[PDB]
Amino acid sequence: NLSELDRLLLELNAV
Amino acid sequence: RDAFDTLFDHAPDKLNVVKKTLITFVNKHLNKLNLEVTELETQFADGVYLVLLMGLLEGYFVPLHSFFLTPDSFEQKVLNVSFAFELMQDGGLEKPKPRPEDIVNCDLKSTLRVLYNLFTKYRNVE
């Protein structure tokens, strides 16, 4: 299982 | 402040991605107990599923005398949630950010934070 959730949270953390 | 504050403030349109992922994860496990969540907003608020999910993920048998299977008051629900938080720390998770009351009050941010921390720790459990 891969999850777009992980990338989403990474991107939000960067903001 | 964390990524969940930024989620609600700056990307609330992505909430469905978050909830779908977490719902899929929790049901993978709860289904083994003939249990099923259809909405994250309300169905963890009484603490029962959280207690049961931890016992399952950690392989602890949680005795019924330890919690309230059918809570009938705010305080019984708070006690369930607190015990679930205790089990999380027994599993090696850090202390949760939300108060147990925040979960009982159906605070979505709090609910997501709690389920996400389970997800990240237990994502590989078959």
mmCIF file of N, CA and C in Angstrom:
data_model
loop_
_atom_site.group_PDB
_atom_site.id
_atom_site.type_symbol
_atom_site.label_atom_id
_atom_site.label_comp_id
_atom_site.label_asym_id
_atom_site.label_seq_id
_atom_site.Cartn_x
_atom_site.Cartn_y
_atom_site.Cartn_z
ATOM 1 N N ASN A 1 0.823 -1.236 0.000
ATOM 2 C CA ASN A 1 0.000 0.000 0.000
ATOM 3 C C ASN A 1 0.847 1.272 0.000
ATOM 4 N N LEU A 2 0.622 2.111 -1.007
ATOM 5 C CA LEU A 2 1.128 3.485 -1.035
ATOM 6 C C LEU A 2 0.009 4.438 -0.657
ATOM 7 N N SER A 3 0.372 5.609 -0.136
ATOM 8 C CA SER A 3 -0.631 6.572 0.290
ATOM 9 C C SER A 3 -0.288 8.015 -0.096
ATOM 10 N N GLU A 4 -1.204 8.678 -0.798
ATOM 11 C CA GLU A 4 -1.016 10.090 -1.104
ATOM 12 C C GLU A 4 -1.086 10.935 0.172
ATOM 13 N N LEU A 5 -1.647 10.370 1.243
ATOM 14 C CA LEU A 5 -1.715 11.077 2.535
ATOM 15 C C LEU A 5 -0.352 11.544 3.016
ATOM 16 N N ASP A 6 0.655 10.679 2.873
ATOM 17 C CA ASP A 6 2.021 10.973 3.333
ATOM 18 C C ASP A 6 2.625 12.199 2.635
ATOM 19 N N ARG A 7 2.541 12.227 1.304
ATOM 20 C CA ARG A 7 2.986 13.382 0.522
ATOM 21 C C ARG A 7 2.203 14.660 0.863
ATOM 22 N N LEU A 8 0.897 14.524 1.087
ATOM 23 C CA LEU A 8 0.042 15.663 1.458
ATOM 24 C C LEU A 8 0.523 16.307 2.763
ATOM 25 N N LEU A 9 0.793 15.487 3.776
ATOM 26 C CA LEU A 9 1.235 16.010 5.071
ATOM 27 C C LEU A 9 2.629 16.629 5.007
ATOM 28 N N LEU A 10 3.500 16.030 4.196
ATOM 29 C CA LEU A 10 4.839 16.565 3.933
ATOM 30 C C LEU A 10 4.765 17.960 3.327
ATOM 31 N N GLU A 11 3.917 18.103 2.313
ATOM 32 C CA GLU A 11 3.707 19.380 1.633
ATOM 33 C C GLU A 11 3.114 20.443 2.565
ATOM 34 N N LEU A 12 2.161 20.036 3.401
ATOM 35 C CA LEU A 12 1.560 20.941 4.383
ATOM 36 C C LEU A 12 2.550 21.361 5.479
ATOM 37 N N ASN A 13 3.431 20.441 5.876
ATOM 38 C CA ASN A 13 4.485 20.737 6.853
ATOM 39 C C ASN A 13 5.464 21.785 6.318
ATOM 40 N N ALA A 14 5.709 21.749 5.007
ATOM 41 C CA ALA A 14 6.646 22.673 4.345
ATOM 42 C C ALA A 14 6.142 24.116 4.286
ATOM 43 N N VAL A 15 4.822 24.289 4.334
ATOM 44 C CA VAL A 15 4.192 25.611 4.276
ATOM 45 C C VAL A 15 4.367 26.355 5.603
ATOM 46 N N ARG B 1 1.267 24.202 16.723
ATOM 47 C CA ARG B 1 0.803 24.087 15.304
ATOM 48 C C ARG B 1 1.445 22.901 14.579
ATOM 49 N N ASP B 2 0.641 22.199 13.789
ATOM 50 C CA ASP B 2 1.124 21.074 12.997
ATOM 51 C C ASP B 2 0.435 21.038 11.632
ATOM 52 N N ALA B 3 0.744 20.007 10.849
ATOM 53 C CA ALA B 3 0.196 19.840 9.507
ATOM 54 C C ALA B 3 -1.337 19.792 9.474
ATOM 55 N N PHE B 4 -1.960 19.356 10.571
ATOM 56 C CA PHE B 4 -3.427 19.309 10.629
ATOM 57 C C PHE B 4 -4.065 20.701 10.760
ATOM 58 N N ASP B 5 -3.406 21.619 11.471
ATOM 59 C CA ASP B 5 -3.867 23.011 11.490
ATOM 60 C C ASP B 5 -3.792 23.627 10.089
ATOM 61 N N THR B 6 -2.678 23.378 9.399
ATOM 62 C CA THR B 6 -2.479 23.847 8.026
ATOM 63 C C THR B 6 -3.492 23.212 7.064
ATOM 64 N N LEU B 7 -3.825 21.945 7.305
ATOM 65 C CA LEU B 7 -4.828 21.229 6.516
ATOM 66 C C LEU B 7 -6.193 21.921 6.545
ATOM 67 N N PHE B 8 -6.684 22.219 7.745
ATOM 68 C CA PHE B 8 -7.989 22.869 7.928
ATOM 69 C C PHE B 8 -7.999 24.329 7.478
ATOM 70 N N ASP B 9 -6.909 25.051 7.747
ATOM 71 C CA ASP B 9 -6.774 26.462 7.378
ATOM 72 C C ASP B 9 -6.511 26.717 5.895
ATOM 73 N N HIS B 10 -5.639 25.916 5.284
ATOM 74 C CA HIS B 10 -5.131 26.222 3.944
ATOM 75 C C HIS B 10 -5.431 25.181 2.861
ATOM 76 N N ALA B 11 -5.892 23.997 3.252
ATOM 77 C CA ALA B 11 -6.224 22.959 2.269
ATOM 78 C C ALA B 11 -7.420 22.102 2.702
ATOM 79 N N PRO B 12 -8.515 22.743 3.180
ATOM 80 C CA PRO B 12 -9.642 21.969 3.725
ATOM 81 C C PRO B 12 -10.283 21.042 2.691
ATOM 82 N N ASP B 13 -10.084 21.358 1.415
ATOM 83 C CA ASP B 13 -10.564 20.535 0.305
ATOM 84 C C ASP B 13 -9.868 19.175 0.192
ATOM 85 N N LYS B 14 -8.806 18.980 0.966
ATOM 86 C CA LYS B 14 -8.067 17.716 0.955
ATOM 87 C C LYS B 14 -8.500 16.803 2.092
ATOM 88 N N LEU B 15 -9.486 17.248 2.870
ATOM 89 C CA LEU B 15 -9.937 16.472 4.020
ATOM 90 C C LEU B 15 -10.447 15.084 3.629
ATOM 91 N N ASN B 16 -11.063 14.965 2.449
ATOM 92 C CA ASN B 16 -11.573 13.665 2.025
ATOM 93 C C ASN B 16 -10.481 12.620 1.822
ATOM 94 N N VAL B 17 -9.339 13.027 1.266
ATOM 95 C CA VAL B 17 -8.146 12.176 1.138
ATOM 96 C C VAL B 17 -7.727 11.627 2.509
ATOM 97 N N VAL B 18 -7.637 12.542 3.484
ATOM 98 C CA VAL B 18 -7.257 12.219 4.848
ATOM 99 C C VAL B 18 -8.231 11.202 5.453
ATOM 100 N N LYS B 19 -9.526 11.492 5.389
ATOM 101 C CA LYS B 19 -10.535 10.634 6.028
ATOM 102 C C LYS B 19 -10.673 9.264 5.358
ATOM 103 N N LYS B 20 -10.584 9.236 4.033
ATOM 104 C CA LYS B 20 -10.659 7.974 3.286
ATOM 105 C C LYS B 20 -9.508 7.034 3.670
ATOM 106 N N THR B 21 -8.291 7.572 3.698
ATOM 107 C CA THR B 21 -7.096 6.800 4.076
ATOM 108 C C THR B 21 -7.225 6.204 5.480
ATOM 109 N N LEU B 22 -7.650 7.044 6.419
ATOM 110 C CA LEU B 22 -7.739 6.627 7.804
ATOM 111 C C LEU B 22 -8.870 5.633 8.011
ATOM 112 N N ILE B 23 -10.000 5.854 7.337
ATOM 113 C CA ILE B 23 -11.192 4.968 7.409
ATOM 114 C C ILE B 23 -10.820 3.573 6.906
ATOM 115 N N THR B 24 -10.082 3.537 5.793
ATOM 116 C CA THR B 24 -9.634 2.266 5.191
ATOM 117 C C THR B 24 -8.729 1.492 6.169
ATOM 118 N N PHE B 25 -7.790 2.202 6.795
ATOM 119 C CA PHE B 25 -6.885 1.637 7.790
ATOM 120 C C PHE B 25 -7.645 1.077 8.996
ATOM 121 N N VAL B 26 -8.493 1.893 9.630
ATOM 122 C CA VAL B 26 -9.200 1.433 10.829
ATOM 123 C C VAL B 26 -10.088 0.219 10.536
ATOM 124 N N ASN B 27 -10.753 0.205 9.387
ATOM 125 C CA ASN B 27 -11.649 -0.909 9.051
ATOM 126 C C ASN B 27 -10.925 -2.207 8.719
ATOM 127 N N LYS B 28 -9.716 -2.090 8.169
ATOM 128 C CA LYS B 28 -8.872 -3.253 7.924
ATOM 129 C C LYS B 28 -8.758 -4.079 9.209
ATOM 130 N N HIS B 29 -8.594 -3.385 10.330
ATOM 131 C CA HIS B 29 -8.465 -4.022 11.634
ATOM 132 C C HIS B 29 -9.797 -4.316 12.338
ATOM 133 N N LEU B 30 -10.671 -3.322 12.417
ATOM 134 C CA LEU B 30 -11.969 -3.496 13.074
ATOM 135 C C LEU B 30 -12.806 -4.590 12.415
ATOM 136 N N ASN B 31 -12.658 -4.763 11.097
ATOM 137 C CA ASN B 31 -13.398 -5.808 10.397
ATOM 138 C C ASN B 31 -13.124 -7.210 10.962
ATOM 139 N N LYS B 32 -11.940 -7.400 11.543
ATOM 140 C CA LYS B 32 -11.557 -8.699 12.115
ATOM 141 C C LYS B 32 -12.407 -9.033 13.352
ATOM 142 N N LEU B 33 -12.962 -7.987 13.959
ATOM 143 C CA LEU B 33 -13.861 -8.105 15.110
ATOM 144 C C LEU B 33 -15.340 -7.926 14.736
ATOM 145 N N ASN B 34 -15.655 -8.064 13.449
ATOM 146 C CA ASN B 34 -17.009 -7.815 12.952
ATOM 147 C C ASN B 34 -17.505 -6.412 13.289
ATOM 148 N N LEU B 35 -16.579 -5.444 13.255
ATOM 149 C CA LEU B 35 -16.886 -4.032 13.494
ATOM 150 C C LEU B 35 -16.520 -3.209 12.258
ATOM 151 N N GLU B 36 -17.187 -2.062 12.073
ATOM 152 C CA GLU B 36 -17.026 -1.224 10.857
ATOM 153 C C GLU B 36 -17.408 0.241 11.132
ATOM 154 N N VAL B 37 -16.503 1.170 10.798
ATOM 155 C CA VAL B 37 -16.740 2.595 10.945
ATOM 156 C C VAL B 37 -17.129 3.147 9.562
ATOM 157 N N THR B 38 -18.187 3.955 9.533
ATOM 158 C CA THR B 38 -18.626 4.625 8.305
ATOM 159 C C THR B 38 -18.447 6.147 8.351
ATOM 160 N N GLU B 39 -18.140 6.685 9.531
ATOM 161 C CA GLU B 39 -17.775 8.096 9.650
ATOM 162 C C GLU B 39 -16.880 8.366 10.847
ATOM 163 N N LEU B 40 -15.762 9.026 10.568
ATOM 164 C CA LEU B 40 -14.763 9.355 11.577
ATOM 165 C C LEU B 40 -15.219 10.457 12.509
ATOM 166 N N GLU B 41 -16.198 11.253 12.076
ATOM 167 C CA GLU B 41 -16.606 12.422 12.855
ATOM 168 C C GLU B 41 -17.241 12.070 14.207
ATOM 169 N N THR B 42 -17.960 10.950 14.259
ATOM 170 C CA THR B 42 -18.760 10.615 15.443
ATOM 171 C C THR B 42 -18.454 9.249 16.065
ATOM 172 N N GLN B 43 -17.960 8.310 15.266
ATOM 173 C CA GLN B 43 -17.956 6.902 15.678
ATOM 174 C C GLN B 43 -16.806 6.452 16.579
ATOM 175 N N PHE B 44 -15.837 7.342 16.823
ATOM 176 C CA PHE B 44 -14.802 7.111 17.824
ATOM 177 C C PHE B 44 -15.033 7.901 19.120
ATOM 178 N N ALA B 45 -16.035 8.773 19.123
ATOM 179 C CA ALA B 45 -16.230 9.682 20.253
ATOM 180 C C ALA B 45 -16.484 9.002 21.617
ATOM 181 N N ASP B 46 -17.129 7.840 21.622
ATOM 182 C CA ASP B 46 -17.398 7.162 22.905
ATOM 183 C C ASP B 46 -16.246 6.312 23.420
ATOM 184 N N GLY B 47 -15.143 6.274 22.667
ATOM 185 C CA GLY B 47 -13.930 5.576 23.089
ATOM 186 C C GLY B 47 -13.873 4.066 22.924
ATOM 187 N N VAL B 48 -15.017 3.443 22.651
ATOM 188 C CA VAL B 48 -15.088 1.987 22.602
ATOM 189 C C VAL B 48 -14.209 1.411 21.484
ATOM 190 N N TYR B 49 -14.408 1.871 20.244
ATOM 191 C CA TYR B 49 -13.586 1.390 19.116
ATOM 192 C C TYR B 49 -12.089 1.657 19.260
ATOM 193 N N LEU B 50 -11.723 2.794 19.858
ATOM 194 C CA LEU B 50 -10.315 3.087 20.111
ATOM 195 C C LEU B 50 -9.697 2.059 21.048
ATOM 196 N N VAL B 51 -10.411 1.709 22.115
ATOM 197 C CA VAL B 51 -9.898 0.703 23.074
ATOM 198 C C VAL B 51 -9.725 -0.634 22.348
ATOM 199 N N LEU B 52 -10.772 -1.041 21.642
ATOM 200 C CA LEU B 52 -10.749 -2.319 20.939
ATOM 201 C C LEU B 52 -9.659 -2.374 19.867
ATOM 202 N N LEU B 53 -9.484 -1.283 19.124
ATOM 203 C CA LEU B 53 -8.436 -1.197 18.094
ATOM 204 C C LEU B 53 -7.014 -1.341 18.667
ATOM 205 N N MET B 54 -6.738 -0.675 19.791
ATOM 206 C CA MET B 54 -5.433 -0.814 20.434
ATOM 207 C C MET B 54 -5.154 -2.232 20.903
ATOM 208 N N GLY B 55 -6.153 -2.881 21.498
ATOM 209 C CA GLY B 55 -5.948 -4.227 22.011
ATOM 210 C C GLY B 55 -5.605 -5.144 20.855
ATOM 211 N N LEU B 56 -6.287 -4.911 19.736
ATOM 212 C CA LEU B 56 -6.074 -5.706 18.540
ATOM 213 C C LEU B 56 -4.689 -5.490 17.955
ATOM 214 N N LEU B 57 -4.311 -4.226 17.739
ATOM 215 C CA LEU B 57 -3.034 -3.880 17.128
ATOM 216 C C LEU B 57 -1.824 -4.310 17.952
ATOM 217 N N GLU B 58 -1.954 -4.276 19.277
ATOM 218 C CA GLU B 58 -0.878 -4.614 20.222
ATOM 219 C C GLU B 58 -0.907 -6.079 20.681
ATOM 220 N N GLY B 59 -1.994 -6.782 20.365
ATOM 221 C CA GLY B 59 -2.177 -8.167 20.804
ATOM 222 C C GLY B 59 -2.412 -8.310 22.299
ATOM 223 N N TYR B 60 -2.988 -7.276 22.909
ATOM 224 C CA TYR B 60 -3.485 -7.355 24.273
ATOM 225 C C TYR B 60 -4.973 -7.677 24.238
ATOM 226 N N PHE B 61 -5.366 -8.661 25.035
ATOM 227 C CA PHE B 61 -6.768 -8.918 25.301
ATOM 228 C C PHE B 61 -7.199 -7.856 26.306
ATOM 229 N N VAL B 62 -8.169 -7.030 25.923
ATOM 230 C CA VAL B 62 -8.668 -5.999 26.829
ATOM 231 C C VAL B 62 -9.938 -6.496 27.520
ATOM 232 N N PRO B 63 -9.879 -6.669 28.850
ATOM 233 C CA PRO B 63 -11.004 -7.233 29.573
ATOM 234 C C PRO B 63 -12.120 -6.206 29.666
ATOM 235 N N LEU B 64 -13.368 -6.678 29.620
ATOM 236 C CA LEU B 64 -14.518 -5.778 29.675
ATOM 237 C C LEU B 64 -14.575 -5.003 30.980
ATOM 238 N N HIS B 65 -14.056 -5.585 32.060
ATOM 239 C CA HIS B 65 -14.063 -4.908 33.357
ATOM 240 C C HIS B 65 -13.150 -3.669 33.386
ATOM 241 N N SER B 66 -12.297 -3.528 32.374
ATOM 242 C CA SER B 66 -11.331 -2.415 32.303
ATOM 243 C C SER B 66 -11.887 -1.112 31.710
ATOM 244 N N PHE B 67 -13.035 -1.198 31.047
ATOM 245 C CA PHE B 67 -13.629 -0.025 30.386
ATOM 246 C C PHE B 67 -15.155 -0.122 30.328
ATOM 247 N N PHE B 68 -15.793 0.799 29.607
ATOM 248 C CA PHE B 68 -17.252 0.790 29.505
ATOM 249 C C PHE B 68 -17.660 0.461 28.075
ATOM 250 N N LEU B 69 -18.125 -0.762 27.878
ATOM 251 C CA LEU B 69 -18.504 -1.206 26.537
ATOM 252 C C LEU B 69 -19.729 -0.420 26.016
ATOM 253 N N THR B 70 -20.615 -0.032 26.929
ATOM 254 C CA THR B 70 -21.847 0.680 26.600
ATOM 255 C C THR B 70 -21.947 1.952 27.443
ATOM 256 N N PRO B 71 -21.082 2.945 27.165
ATOM 257 C CA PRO B 71 -21.032 4.143 28.023
ATOM 258 C C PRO B 71 -22.324 4.962 27.969
ATOM 259 N N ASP B 72 -22.750 5.479 29.116
ATOM 260 C CA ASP B 72 -24.040 6.159 29.214
ATOM 261 C C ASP B 72 -23.929 7.588 29.714
ATOM 262 N N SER B 73 -22.697 8.070 29.821
ATOM 263 C CA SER B 73 -22.439 9.419 30.273
ATOM 264 C C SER B 73 -21.185 9.972 29.611
ATOM 265 N N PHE B 74 -21.075 11.295 29.613
ATOM 266 C CA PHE B 74 -19.867 11.967 29.174
ATOM 267 C C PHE B 74 -18.640 11.382 29.878
ATOM 268 N N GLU B 75 -18.700 11.244 31.205
ATOM 269 C CA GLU B 75 -17.535 10.771 31.973
ATOM 270 C C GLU B 75 -17.115 9.320 31.655
ATOM 271 N N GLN B 76 -18.077 8.424 31.431
ATOM 272 C CA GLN B 76 -17.732 7.071 30.976
ATOM 273 C C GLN B 76 -16.991 7.093 29.627
ATOM 274 N N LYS B 77 -17.443 7.960 28.723
ATOM 275 C CA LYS B 77 -16.796 8.103 27.421
ATOM 276 C C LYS B 77 -15.398 8.695 27.573
ATOM 277 N N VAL B 78 -15.237 9.681 28.462
ATOM 278 C CA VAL B 78 -13.909 10.271 28.717
ATOM 279 C C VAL B 78 -12.959 9.222 29.284
ATOM 280 N N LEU B 79 -13.474 8.388 30.186
ATOM 281 C CA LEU B 79 -12.677 7.314 30.787
ATOM 282 C C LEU B 79 -12.221 6.287 29.742
ATOM 283 N N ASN B 80 -13.116 5.900 28.829
ATOM 284 C CA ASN B 80 -12.759 5.036 27.693
ATOM 285 C C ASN B 80 -11.624 5.629 26.847
ATOM 286 N N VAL B 81 -11.807 6.878 26.440
ATOM 287 C CA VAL B 81 -10.786 7.565 25.631
ATOM 288 C C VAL B 81 -9.437 7.641 26.361
ATOM 289 N N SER B 82 -9.439 8.077 27.632
ATOM 290 C CA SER B 82 -8.224 8.104 28.441
ATOM 291 C C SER B 82 -7.527 6.743 28.497
ATOM 292 N N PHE B 83 -8.313 5.670 28.654
ATOM 293 C CA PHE B 83 -7.743 4.325 28.702
ATOM 294 C C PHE B 83 -7.155 3.974 27.334
ATOM 295 N N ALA B 84 -7.841 4.359 26.255
ATOM 296 C CA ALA B 84 -7.289 4.120 24.921
ATOM 297 C C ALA B 84 -5.948 4.862 24.768
ATOM 298 N N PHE B 85 -5.868 6.086 25.291
ATOM 299 C CA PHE B 85 -4.621 6.882 25.238
ATOM 300 C C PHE B 85 -3.513 6.172 26.037
ATOM 301 N N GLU B 86 -3.875 5.648 27.208
ATOM 302 C CA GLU B 86 -2.964 4.828 28.005
ATOM 303 C C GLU B 86 -2.423 3.625 27.209
ATOM 304 N N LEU B 87 -3.319 2.899 26.551
ATOM 305 C CA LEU B 87 -2.913 1.768 25.719
ATOM 306 C C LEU B 87 -1.987 2.195 24.582
ATOM 307 N N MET B 88 -2.276 3.329 23.960
ATOM 308 C CA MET B 88 -1.367 3.883 22.947
ATOM 309 C C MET B 88 0.044 4.070 23.479
ATOM 310 N N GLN B 89 0.171 4.650 24.669
ATOM 311 C CA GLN B 89 1.495 4.836 25.248
ATOM 312 C C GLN B 89 2.149 3.496 25.642
ATOM 313 N N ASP B 90 1.346 2.525 26.092
ATOM 314 C CA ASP B 90 1.811 1.144 26.316
ATOM 315 C C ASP B 90 2.306 0.475 25.020
ATOM 316 N N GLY B 91 1.797 0.938 23.882
ATOM 317 C CA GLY B 91 2.240 0.470 22.564
ATOM 318 C C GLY B 91 3.494 1.171 22.060
ATOM 319 N N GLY B 92 3.967 2.168 22.805
ATOM 320 C CA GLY B 92 5.161 2.926 22.433
ATOM 321 C C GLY B 92 4.983 4.221 21.647
ATOM 322 N N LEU B 93 3.721 4.631 21.524
ATOM 323 C CA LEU B 93 3.335 5.911 20.951
ATOM 324 C C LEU B 93 3.558 6.931 22.054
ATOM 325 N N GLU B 94 3.769 8.178 21.645
ATOM 326 C CA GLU B 94 3.955 9.262 22.600
ATOM 327 C C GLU B 94 2.594 9.709 23.093
ATOM 328 N N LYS B 95 2.570 10.553 24.123
ATOM 329 C CA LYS B 95 1.281 11.070 24.600
ATOM 330 C C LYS B 95 0.531 11.839 23.494
ATOM 331 N N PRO B 96 -0.740 11.473 23.231
ATOM 332 C CA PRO B 96 -1.523 12.195 22.219
ATOM 333 C C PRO B 96 -1.665 13.681 22.514
ATOM 334 N N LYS B 97 -1.750 14.477 21.449
ATOM 335 C CA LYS B 97 -1.905 15.929 21.552
ATOM 336 C C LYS B 97 -3.259 16.336 22.162
ATOM 337 N N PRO B 98 -4.376 15.742 21.684
ATOM 338 C CA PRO B 98 -5.694 16.130 22.197
ATOM 339 C C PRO B 98 -5.942 15.643 23.608
ATOM 340 N N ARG B 99 -6.835 16.329 24.311
ATOM 341 C CA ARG B 99 -7.355 15.857 25.582
ATOM 342 C C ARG B 99 -8.392 14.779 25.268
ATOM 343 N N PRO B 100 -8.632 13.846 26.210
ATOM 344 C CA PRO B 100 -9.668 12.842 25.922
ATOM 345 C C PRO B 100 -11.037 13.480 25.648
ATOM 346 N N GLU B 101 -11.331 14.587 26.338
ATOM 347 C CA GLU B 101 -12.581 15.350 26.132
ATOM 348 C C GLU B 101 -12.767 15.837 24.686
ATOM 349 N N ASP B 102 -11.666 16.180 24.011
ATOM 350 C CA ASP B 102 -11.736 16.655 22.616
ATOM 351 C C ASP B 102 -12.290 15.560 21.702
ATOM 352 N N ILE B 103 -11.895 14.314 21.954
ATOM 353 C CA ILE B 103 -12.411 13.162 21.193
ATOM 354 C C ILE B 103 -13.899 12.929 21.496
ATOM 355 N N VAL B 104 -14.253 13.020 22.772
ATOM 356 C CA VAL B 104 -15.650 12.795 23.203
ATOM 357 C C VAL B 104 -16.559 13.862 22.596
ATOM 358 N N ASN B 105 -16.003 15.063 22.401
ATOM 359 C CA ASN B 105 -16.715 16.209 21.810
ATOM 360 C C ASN B 105 -16.729 16.235 20.271
ATOM 361 N N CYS B 106 -16.225 15.168 19.655
ATOM 362 C CA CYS B 106 -16.222 15.010 18.201
ATOM 363 C C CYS B 106 -15.413 16.109 17.493
ATOM 364 N N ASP B 107 -14.354 16.600 18.133
ATOM 365 C CA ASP B 107 -13.430 17.510 17.441
ATOM 366 C C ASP B 107 -12.685 16.770 16.315
ATOM 367 N N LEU B 108 -12.977 17.131 15.064
ATOM 368 C CA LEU B 108 -12.453 16.358 13.930
ATOM 369 C C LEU B 108 -10.931 16.381 13.858
ATOM 370 N N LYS B 109 -10.332 17.557 14.071
ATOM 371 C CA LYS B 109 -8.867 17.702 14.062
ATOM 372 C C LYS B 109 -8.224 16.723 15.037
ATOM 373 N N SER B 110 -8.769 16.685 16.252
ATOM 374 C CA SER B 110 -8.271 15.807 17.322
ATOM 375 C C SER B 110 -8.389 14.347 16.917
ATOM 376 N N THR B 111 -9.553 13.991 16.373
ATOM 377 C CA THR B 111 -9.816 12.632 15.927
ATOM 378 C C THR B 111 -8.823 12.192 14.849
ATOM 379 N N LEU B 112 -8.566 13.080 13.891
ATOM 380 C CA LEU B 112 -7.624 12.800 12.805
ATOM 381 C C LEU B 112 -6.198 12.651 13.317
ATOM 382 N N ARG B 113 -5.794 13.512 14.249
ATOM 383 C CA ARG B 113 -4.456 13.450 14.813
ATOM 384 C C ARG B 113 -4.237 12.094 15.480
ATOM 385 N N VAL B 114 -5.216 11.657 16.273
ATOM 386 C CA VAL B 114 -5.138 10.368 16.989
ATOM 387 C C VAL B 114 -5.082 9.184 16.011
ATOM 388 N N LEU B 115 -5.969 9.176 15.023
ATOM 389 C CA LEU B 115 -5.979 8.065 14.070
ATOM 390 C C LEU B 115 -4.736 8.065 13.169
ATOM 391 N N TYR B 116 -4.247 9.254 12.808
ATOM 392 C CA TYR B 116 -3.041 9.334 11.989
ATOM 393 C C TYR B 116 -1.825 8.761 12.708
ATOM 394 N N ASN B 117 -1.684 9.078 13.991
ATOM 395 C CA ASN B 117 -0.570 8.521 14.755
ATOM 396 C C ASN B 117 -0.606 6.986 14.857
ATOM 397 N N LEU B 118 -1.808 6.407 14.910
ATOM 398 C CA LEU B 118 -1.956 4.948 14.819
ATOM 399 C C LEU B 118 -1.567 4.446 13.450
ATOM 400 N N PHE B 119 -2.050 5.137 12.424
ATOM 401 C CA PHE B 119 -1.751 4.787 11.043
ATOM 402 C C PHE B 119 -0.248 4.690 10.747
ATOM 403 N N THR B 120 0.486 5.709 11.181
ATOM 404 C CA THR B 120 1.893 5.825 10.893
ATOM 405 C C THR B 120 2.712 4.743 11.616
ATOM 406 N N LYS B 121 2.286 4.370 12.821
ATOM 407 C CA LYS B 121 2.919 3.347 13.651
ATOM 408 C C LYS B 121 2.579 1.923 13.181
ATOM 409 N N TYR B 122 1.298 1.701 12.877
ATOM 410 C CA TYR B 122 0.790 0.361 12.583
ATOM 411 C C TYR B 122 0.444 0.074 11.127
ATOM 412 N N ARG B 123 0.975 0.883 10.212
ATOM 413 C CA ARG B 123 0.571 0.782 8.816
ATOM 414 C C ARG B 123 0.893 -0.566 8.155
ATOM 415 N N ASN B 124 1.927 -1.250 8.643
ATOM 416 C CA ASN B 124 2.360 -2.527 8.077
ATOM 417 C C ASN B 124 1.681 -3.764 8.679
ATOM 418 N N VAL B 125 0.872 -3.576 9.717
ATOM 419 C CA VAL B 125 0.199 -4.720 10.339
ATOM 420 C C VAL B 125 -0.826 -5.294 9.367
ATOM 421 N N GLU B 126 -0.693 -6.582 9.064
ATOM 422 C CA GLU B 126 -1.578 -7.248 8.108
ATOM 423 C C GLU B 126 -2.963 -7.517 8.702
#
